[PDB]
């Protein structure tokens with residue numbers, strides 16, 4: 001049972017602009033997704049400060065980066081607070097309508113595209129490198145869901161019958177054919193060291209056979 005939804009017009013506009021503008025500094029997508037993961041981890045940590053049972057679904061707070069060259073995917077996994085179904089539908093828990101407006105306004109006033117994260121819509125920089133993004137998520141208050149979009153104005157949501165995650169979010173980047181450098185271990189390490197060196201959670205870069 002798969003539900004298909006239209007993006008709000010402003011979010012569709014933001015994604016087409018990310019996909020179609022010439023912009024060489026594509027590596028910032030990983031900084032943005034790691035920062036989102038850190039934000040989600042902060043949230044569950046804060047909730048656990050007054051209710052330790054919030055961590056019954058997983059005590060470890062971490063970020064994993066999993067490249068897969070056979071599948072041409074880069075997966076970012078965190079054990080943060082996760083997202084409910086309503087969150088997923090409401091632009092993955094972002095205020096994306098007003099954030100997009102402020103981002104394009106900032107761009108008029110001399111802001112850079114790499115400052116997308118300052119407007120709360122850094123998730124959508126995934127489409128700098130990915131032709132399709134799958135988001136698997138489990139929040140303590142809801143079931144496990146999969147969101148998916150290849151842009152083009154729509155996204156889908158379904159219950160996820162895959163591998164149970166306990167709690168958190170998995171962003172699966174189905175990379176564009178010319179963006180496979182982001183599966184290479186030395187390239188990922190370079191980006192994490194450059195842009196994410198002070199993230200307050202362990203970031204583990206998985207290796208492949």
Ligand SMILES: CS(=O)(=O)Nc1ccc(Cl)cc1
Pocket residue numbers: 017018019021022023107113114116125128
């Ligand atoms: C400069 S623009 O027309 O806003 N395009 C754009 C905006 C955001 C990203 Cl991440 C990439 C390109």
Ligand SMILES: CS(=O)(=O)Nc1ccc(Cl)cc1
Pocket residue numbers: 065188189190192193194196197198199203204205
């Ligand atoms: C930049 S850091 O947090 O000091 N260490 C690190 C560097 C690279 C990767 Cl892929 C993972 C962790």
